[PDB]
């Protein structure tokens, strides 16, 4: 006779953007950066009894800071300055993007060896062994409080995805070391063992967008198709730099806009370096004993009011103070 609440939060595409700066103008910004979308990471959390908060990737990789870091290289005993930042937000888990390959393999295992929180892909395979390169999904047990206040675990699994196009846009760095699988396939080879093994939800982490689209196999932006897959719970996505929900994709199949679902399952793609913040809420019920999700919302909250030309989220001074060496530093880097 439980019901509880849950928040799943998503950033996507920060590409490096930790600070509220523009290097090549060298001037701050409301705009964009990590240190103003964790405010709205901590909002959330108060106005929610129970969450949880993923990446969808494209993080390490397409601002100065990452230039900086990139050409420094990863061996002067500093882990990369976006997991110093995101290490202090309480990540769940980290998917991996297509950016994540730009410097080769040893330099993602490098980056991703300095994050305090797991990541996951399933649909890259490596050559030598004809199975996942990395780990396809994790099965997470999270304590959460019903809406009377009693504890219960809830087993969250997490799977993730990039696109198969990173063949070649990384053809140098991958091509005869992984290859890389379908992301709908993917989803339908994994997702019932996902369940078997006693998830009670699962929220798939593509890096790719939204077409409705016929499919065909090897389409890089597969989340339709995603959200015809049974077992899915949820669907955190990117890599389109879009927003999703949002008049934008109105014309797109099965998509409901004010409540942020495709096919009745909820779905977000906030944004593109740190501009909003993804949020699924769900209300689940325990009435027949295994968890049912009998609700389901998503939207994108924008760090900046653009109607009304203000800030809806403030830069937050310990992320700044964390970042503030790396900051000059990248401002250095930019001036040399
Ligand atoms: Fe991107
Ligand atoms: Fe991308
Ligand atoms: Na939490
Ligand atoms: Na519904």
Same mark, same amino acid.
């Given at each position: 006779a439980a019901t509880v609440d849950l928040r799943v939060l998503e950033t996507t595409d920060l590409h490096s953007n930790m600070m509220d700066f523009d290097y090549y103008k060298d001037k701050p910004t409301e705009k964009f950066g990590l240190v103003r979308t964790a405010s709205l990471i901590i909002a959330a959390r108060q106005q929610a009894t129970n969450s949880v908060l993923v990446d969808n990737g494209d993080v390490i990789q397409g601002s100065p800071l990452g230039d900086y870091i990139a050409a420094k290289g990863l061996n002067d005993g500093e882990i990369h300055p976006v997991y110093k930042a995101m290490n202090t937000l309480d990540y769940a888990v980290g998917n991996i993007g297509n950016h994540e390959f730009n410097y080769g393999l040893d330099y993602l295992k490098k980056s991703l060896a300095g994050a305090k929180f797991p990541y996951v892909n399933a649909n890259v395979i490596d050559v030598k062994t004809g199975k996942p390169l990395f780990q396809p999904y994790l099965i997470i047990d999270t304590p959460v409080k019903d809406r009377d206040g009693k504890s219960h675990n809830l087993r969250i699994g997490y799977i993730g995805f990039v696109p198969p196009q990173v063949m070649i846009w990384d053809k140098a760095n991958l091509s005869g070391k992984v290859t890389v699988n379908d992301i709908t396939e993917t989803?339908?080879?994994?997702?019932?063992?996902?369940?078997?093994?006693?998830?009670?939800?699962?929220?798939?982490?593509?890096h790719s967008g939204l077409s409705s689209d016929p499919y065909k196999t090897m389409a890089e932006n597969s989340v339709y198709y995603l959200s015809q897959v049974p077992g899915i719970d949820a669907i955190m996505f990117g890599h389109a730099h879009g927003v999703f929900p949002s008049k934008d994709f109105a014309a797109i199949k099965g998509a409901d806009i004010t409540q942020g679902t495709?096919?009745?399952?909820?779905?977000?793609?906030?944004?593109?370096?740190? /501009? %909003?913040?993804?949020?699924? *809420? =769900? &209300?689940?019920?325990?009435?027949?004993?295994?968890?049912?999700?009998?609700?389901?919302?998503?939207?994108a909250r924008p760090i900046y009011?653009?109607?009304?030309?203000?800030?809806?989220?403030?830069?937050?001074?310990?992320?700044?103070?964390?970042?503030?060496? /790396? %900051?000059?530093?990248?401002? *250095? =880097? &930019?001036?040399?």
């Open positions: 989803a339908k080879k994994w997702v019932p063992e996902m369940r078997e093994q006693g998830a009670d939800l699962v929220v798939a982490i593509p495709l096919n009745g399952i909820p779905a977000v793609m906030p944004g593109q370096w740190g /501009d %909003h913040l993804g949020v699924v *809420d =769900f &209300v689940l019920n325990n009435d027949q004993g295994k968890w049912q999700v009998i609700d389901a919302k998503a939207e009011d653009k109607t009304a030309q203000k800030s809806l989220a403030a830069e937050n001074a310990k992320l700044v103070e964390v970042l503030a060496v /790396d %900051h000059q530093s990248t401002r *250095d =880097f &930019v001036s040399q």
